[PDB]
Amino acid sequence: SGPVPSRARVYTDVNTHRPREYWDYESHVVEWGNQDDYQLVRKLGRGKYSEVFEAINITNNEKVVVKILKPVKKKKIKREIKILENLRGGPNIITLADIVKDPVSRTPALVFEHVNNTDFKQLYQTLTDYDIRFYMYEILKALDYCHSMGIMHRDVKPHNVMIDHEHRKLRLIDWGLAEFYHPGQEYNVRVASRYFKGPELLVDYQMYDYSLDMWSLGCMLASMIFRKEPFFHGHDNYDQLVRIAKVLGTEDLYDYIDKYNIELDPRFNDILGRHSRKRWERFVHSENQHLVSPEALDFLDKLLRYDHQSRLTAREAMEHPYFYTVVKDQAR
Numbered sequence: 001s002g003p004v005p006s007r008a009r010v011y012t013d014v015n016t017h018r019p020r021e022y023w024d025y026e027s028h029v030v031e032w033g034n035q036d037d038y039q040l041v042r043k044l045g046r047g048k049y050s051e052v053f054e055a056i057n058i059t060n061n062e063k064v065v066v067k068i069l070k071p072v073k074k075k076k077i078k079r080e081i082k083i084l085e086n087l088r089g090g091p092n093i094i095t096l097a098d099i100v101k102d103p104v105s106r107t108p109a110l111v112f113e114h115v116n117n118t119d120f121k122q123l124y125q126t127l128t129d130y131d132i133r134f135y136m137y138e139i140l141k142a143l144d145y146c147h148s149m150g151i152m153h154r155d156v157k158p159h160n161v162m163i164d165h166e167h168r169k170l171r172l173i174d175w176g177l178a179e180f181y182h183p184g185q186e187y188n189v190r191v192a193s194r195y196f197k198g199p200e201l202l203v204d205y206q207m208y209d210y211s212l213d214m215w216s217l218g219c220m221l222a223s224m225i226f227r228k229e230p231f232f233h234g235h236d237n238y239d240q241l242v243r244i245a246k247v248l249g250t251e252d253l254y255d256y257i258d259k260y261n262i263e264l265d266p267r268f269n270d271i272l273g274r275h276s277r278k279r280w281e282r283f284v285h286s287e288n289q290h291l292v293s294p295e296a297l298d299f300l301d302k303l304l305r306y307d308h309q310s311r312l313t314a315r316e317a318m319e320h321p322y323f324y325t326v327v328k329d330q331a332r
């Protein structure tokens with residue numbers, strides 16, 4: 001037989017209750033602006049499939065960000081604009097300000113309001129125990145909002161979280177892999193970035209949901225508290241799952257496979273072996289122990305589960321004891 005089906009435990013049917021227009025992005029009609037409204041200042045970096053520049057809107061002297069898109073299918077560009085439009089103004093979501101083409105090259109680009117940050121490569125090292133709870137909290141607000149709106153991000157990782165540490169603000173960026181959740185849909189598993197891929201993607205289970213983003217969050221949490229970036233460091237997709245199996249063990253992994261009747265690629269037979277599930281204390285040492293607490297480990301353990309159904313939802317994650325003091329500090 002084939003694989004056993006699966007549904008999200010929350011927000012299962014929110015797209016069904018919307019007008020078709022909200023999620024039927026193939027039919028979205030885009031009005032394209034003129035890129036001559038913007039003068040590029042400097043190259044800032046790259047998205048998953050784009051080049052990103054600092055620019056100035058000359059009509060109002062406003063600082064913006066210009067993301068010039070690499071040639072991708074026309075419906076994927078529609079998908080990202082529609083998702084950005086649907087999510088605009090929500091907590092911690094990057095704000096799309098305009099859409100343009102370079103009049104000469106025809107090439108499409110998205111214009112975001114400017115947000116300044118400190119690179120994660122520099123930042124993580126400086127973070128206090130409190131700071132990790134704080135920003136994790138802020139991330140979880142962006143995830144619960146997008147999940148509640150019918151949308152999985154599908155590329156959660158440190159590069160995609162811009163933190164203005166000076167002002168204690170954060171934005172979730174790069175929505176070019178995000179999709180609408182619909183019960184029963186079978187999604188492409190070639191998404192996310194290797195170290196942050198859920199076991200669902202690695203074993204080729206196509207009927208996944210919001211809970212994918214929560215695995216990615218847990219990978220991030222693990223790198224921050226153990227001071228090890230990235231936490232699961234595989235060389236390719238297969239070895240990514242060997243490295244998880246040596247932490248979480250092989251017993252739950254095979255129970256996982258049995259439950260959903262997943263056909264394992266024969267290539268996994270000899271490399272996976274047989275591994276016990278390890279106690280988190282193994283990763284604690286003198287450089288990181290100030291960030292590790294019984295509260296941190298309980299939370300972490302409830303994110304990193306093979307069985308996607310059994311991971312915390314964003315909203316549950318926000319009710320965890322690990323966040324009690326940030327909740328108290330906030331409101332107010």
Ligand SMILES: O=C1c2ccc(O)c(O)c2C(=O)c2c(O)ccc(O)c21
Pocket residue numbers: 044045046047048052065067094112115173174175
């Ligand atoms: O603001 C974005 C930004 C805003 C929205 C995006 O979708 C995005 O990919 C980026 C982005 O990749 C980026 C970057 O790679 C380097 C510096 C940045 O300021 C950004």
